[PDB]
Amino acid sequence: RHFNELRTMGETLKYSEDLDFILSDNSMTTPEHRRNNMLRLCLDMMNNEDLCQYIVKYRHREVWEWCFQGTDPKQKVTSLLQCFIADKIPLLRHDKRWAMLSLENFILPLATDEVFPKKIAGSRLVKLNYQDLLRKLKFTNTCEYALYIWATYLLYTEAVYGAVPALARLISRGQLKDWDTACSLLENNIVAAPSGSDIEEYAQAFQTLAGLSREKLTNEGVLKCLIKLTNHTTVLELSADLLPSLVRSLAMSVQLHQNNIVSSISEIKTNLLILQLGLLLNIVSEATTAASTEELTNFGAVFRSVFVKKPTEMSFVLQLFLLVYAYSAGAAGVQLPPAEADFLKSELEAFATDVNIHTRITRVLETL
């Protein structure tokens, strides 16, 4: 802290001389000049904690209103520096100036555009400052940074227009390092009590995600989105033609990890199987699709193996598997023999007794 050294008004004035210049209209001559001065400020903040505390304690709002005085999602480097500023000196969460970062016009467009420039046009010093700051930034593009800002600071008790389809497009066409943040934003933008226009958005969104690759379908975020969209049954009616291929990919992934159903000591395989079975359960419980009901066939061999070697204690993953098996057996016209049907019934009744699942147990118990 060079700042705790300062004693007099003349030293204090010198200290903040460059900031005052950067803040003035003399540094905003051109887009490029605004960008370059914004870059020197951000690199000085990155390198000097004293400077950040100084800004927060005395110049907070002035700096915020200057950084966010104009935003444009096509201005990539500038938008990156603005994402840095929001994260480096955030305002308190009740401050109305958070609305200077428009979700609709700024964040949502940045969060869904994967194009980011690798090099900056300008002097050698500019280029050096830029390469310097990038090595220190949390994210090095605006797609990631904008999702991060959105999820950290701008998640209001509101849904934002066209977010759901736009996020689904990103998740399907994109390649992010991590899907958790984008998927969470999609999940949080699905409302409890939607309108019909909302339902069309969800339906569109689901359709876009229903054909995702096998590999994206092993992502926990993705699966939770799919579950949340398909908790709305009109979504499944509107998308009936996609369901058999989705069921197939889910069933093949479960078959792949089938040894882990009875007993798993891997958190990630347990969680994957709980989410894939929960997705299958939303589908098989509400859509007796004619084509799907063939891929689920291999669930019988797993059910048989479990009946021969009844585990001593029943994992949640196994109870969920049995519940999905019971629906697929009903769809396939399978008749269980008496000891099998009594094992399945007794397991499901005990599952009902443990603290949307209860209703779906109740409903399949009627077929036994």
Side-chain angles (χ1 to χ4, degrees), residues 4 8 11 14 30 38 89 101 113 145 149 153 170 176 280 293 331 341:
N4 59 51
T8 61
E11 290 175 326
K14 200 81 181 195
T30 208
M38 185 177 303
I89 49 169
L101 288 72
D113 182 8
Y145 230 144
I149 294 304
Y153 300 105
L170 175 72
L176 285 171
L280 280 166
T293 307

Short mmCIF file of all heavy atoms in Angstrom, two decimals, residues 4 8 11 14 30 38 89 101 113 145 149 153 170 176 280 293 331 341:
data_model
loop_
_atom_site.label_atom_id
_atom_site.label_comp_id
_atom_site.label_asym_id
_atom_site.label_seq_id
_atom_site.Cartn_x
_atom_site.Cartn_y
_atom_site.Cartn_z
N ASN A 4 -1.05 4.04 1.98
CA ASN A 4 -0.96 4.38 3.41
C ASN A 4 0.25 5.27 3.73
O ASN A 4 0.25 5.99 4.72
CB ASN A 4 -1.24 3.20 4.40
CG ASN A 4 -0.30 2.00 4.24
OD1 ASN A 4 0.93 2.14 4.22
ND2 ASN A 4 -0.88 0.80 4.19
N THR A 8 -0.23 14.11 2.64
CA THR A 8 -0.76 15.40 2.27
C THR A 8 -1.67 15.33 1.07
O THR A 8 -1.62 14.34 0.29
CB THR A 8 0.38 16.38 1.96
OG1 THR A 8 1.14 15.87 0.85
CG2 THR A 8 1.28 16.59 3.23
N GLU A 11 0.33 14.87 -2.29
CA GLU A 11 0.68 13.46 -2.50
C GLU A 11 -0.58 12.65 -2.92
O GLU A 11 -0.50 11.80 -3.78
CB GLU A 11 1.27 12.85 -1.23
CG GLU A 11 2.66 13.36 -0.85
CD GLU A 11 3.17 12.82 0.49
OE1 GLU A 11 2.35 12.59 1.41
OE2 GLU A 11 4.40 12.60 0.65
N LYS A 14 -1.47 13.51 -6.59
CA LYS A 14 -0.54 12.80 -7.48
C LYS A 14 -0.93 11.31 -7.63
O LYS A 14 -1.01 10.78 -8.74
CB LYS A 14 0.90 12.91 -6.96
CG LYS A 14 1.96 12.64 -8.03
CD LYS A 14 2.20 13.89 -8.89
CE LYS A 14 3.23 13.69 -10.01
NZ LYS A 14 3.70 14.99 -10.59
N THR A 30 -11.20 7.76 -28.53
CA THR A 30 -11.67 6.74 -29.46
C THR A 30 -11.96 5.39 -28.74
O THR A 30 -11.42 5.15 -27.66
CB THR A 30 -10.65 6.60 -30.58
OG1 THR A 30 -11.31 6.16 -31.76
CG2 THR A 30 -9.55 5.63 -30.25
N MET A 38 -8.61 1.61 -20.27
CA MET A 38 -9.28 0.68 -19.40
C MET A 38 -8.32 -0.46 -19.08
O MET A 38 -8.20 -0.90 -17.92
CB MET A 38 -10.60 0.21 -19.99
CG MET A 38 -11.36 -0.69 -19.02
SD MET A 38 -12.94 -1.19 -19.66
CE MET A 38 -13.75 0.38 -19.98
N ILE A 89 -13.94 -5.42 -8.24
CA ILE A 89 -14.53 -4.44 -7.30
C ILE A 89 -16.06 -4.46 -7.37
O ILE A 89 -16.68 -3.46 -7.72
CB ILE A 89 -14.00 -3.00 -7.56
CG1 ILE A 89 -14.09 -2.63 -9.05
CG2 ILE A 89 -12.55 -2.91 -7.16
CD1 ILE A 89 -13.83 -1.16 -9.34
N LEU A 101 -25.20 -3.34 -16.16
CA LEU A 101 -24.84 -4.57 -16.88
C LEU A 101 -26.15 -5.25 -17.30
O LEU A 101 -26.70 -6.07 -16.56
CB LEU A 101 -24.04 -5.53 -16.01
CG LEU A 101 -22.58 -5.18 -15.67
CD1 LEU A 101 -22.55 -4.04 -14.68
CD2 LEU A 101 -21.84 -6.36 -15.06
N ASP A 113 -21.68 -16.19 -27.01
CA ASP A 113 -20.81 -16.02 -28.17
C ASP A 113 -19.40 -16.55 -27.87
O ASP A 113 -18.66 -15.97 -27.09
CB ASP A 113 -20.81 -14.55 -28.60
CG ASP A 113 -19.94 -14.29 -29.87
OD1 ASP A 113 -19.46 -15.27 -30.52
OD2 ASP A 113 -19.77 -13.10 -30.23
N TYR A 145 -16.34 -15.66 -18.73
CA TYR A 145 -16.45 -14.57 -17.80
C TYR A 145 -17.88 -14.06 -17.65
O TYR A 145 -18.31 -13.86 -16.51
CB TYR A 145 -15.42 -13.43 -18.07
CG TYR A 145 -14.65 -13.00 -16.81
CD1 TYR A 145 -13.32 -12.62 -16.88
CD2 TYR A 145 -15.30 -13.01 -15.52
CE1 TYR A 145 -12.61 -12.29 -15.71
CE2 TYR A 145 -14.62 -12.65 -14.37
CZ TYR A 145 -13.28 -12.29 -14.46
OH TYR A 145 -12.65 -11.90 -13.27
N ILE A 149 -20.16 -14.02 -14.29
CA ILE A 149 -20.76 -12.78 -13.75
C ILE A 149 -22.27 -12.93 -13.55
O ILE A 149 -22.83 -12.54 -12.49
CB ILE A 149 -20.43 -11.52 -14.61
CG1 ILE A 149 -18.93 -11.20 -14.56
CG2 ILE A 149 -21.27 -10.32 -14.20
CD1 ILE A 149 -18.39 -11.00 -13.15
N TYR A 153 -23.44 -12.75 -9.68
CA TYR A 153 -23.88 -11.44 -9.27
C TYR A 153 -25.19 -11.05 -9.80
O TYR A 153 -25.79 -10.15 -9.24
CB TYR A 153 -22.87 -10.32 -9.69
CG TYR A 153 -21.49 -10.46 -9.12
CD1 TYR A 153 -20.45 -10.90 -9.91
CD2 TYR A 153 -21.21 -10.13 -7.77
CE1 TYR A 153 -19.19 -11.06 -9.40
CE2 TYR A 153 -19.93 -10.29 -7.27
CZ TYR A 153 -18.94 -10.75 -8.08
OH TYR A 153 -17.63 -10.93 -7.65
N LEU A 170 -26.22 -22.97 -26.80
CA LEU A 170 -24.82 -22.96 -26.39
C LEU A 170 -24.37 -24.31 -25.95
O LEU A 170 -23.26 -24.78 -26.23
CB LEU A 170 -24.57 -21.92 -25.26
CG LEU A 170 -23.18 -21.85 -24.61
CD1 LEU A 170 -22.17 -21.22 -25.58
CD2 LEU A 170 -23.27 -20.99 -23.33
N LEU A 176 -17.56 -25.87 -23.87
CA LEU A 176 -16.98 -25.19 -22.72
C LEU A 176 -16.14 -26.18 -21.94
O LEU A 176 -16.39 -27.36 -21.99
CB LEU A 176 -18.07 -24.57 -21.85
CG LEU A 176 -18.66 -23.29 -22.46
CD1 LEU A 176 -19.88 -22.82 -21.67
CD2 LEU A 176 -17.59 -22.21 -22.52
N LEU A 280 -34.54 -40.99 -17.10
CA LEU A 280 -35.32 -42.09 -17.64
C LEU A 280 -36.64 -42.22 -16.97
O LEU A 280 -37.65 -42.47 -17.64
CB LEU A 280 -34.60 -43.43 -17.46
CG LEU A 280 -33.51 -43.67 -18.50
CD1 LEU A 280 -32.61 -44.84 -18.09
CD2 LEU A 280 -34.20 -44.04 -19.79
N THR A 293 -39.14 -48.53 -25.94
CA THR A 293 -39.43 -49.80 -25.31
C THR A 293 -38.82 -50.97 -26.08
O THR A 293 -39.54 -51.87 -26.50
CB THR A 293 -40.97 -49.93 -25.17
OG1 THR A 293 -41.48 -48.76 -24.51
CG2 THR A 293 -41.36 -51.15 -24.36
N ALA A 331 -44.28 -51.33 -19.69
CA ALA A 331 -44.35 -50.93 -21.09
C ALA A 331 -44.08 -52.07 -22.07
O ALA A 331 -44.51 -52.00 -23.21
CB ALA A 331 -43.40 -49.75 -21.40
N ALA A 341 -41.79 -61.00 -8.44
CA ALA A 341 -42.73 -59.91 -8.34
C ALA A 341 -42.85 -59.53 -6.89
O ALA A 341 -43.03 -58.38 -6.61
CB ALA A 341 -44.06 -60.35 -8.91
#
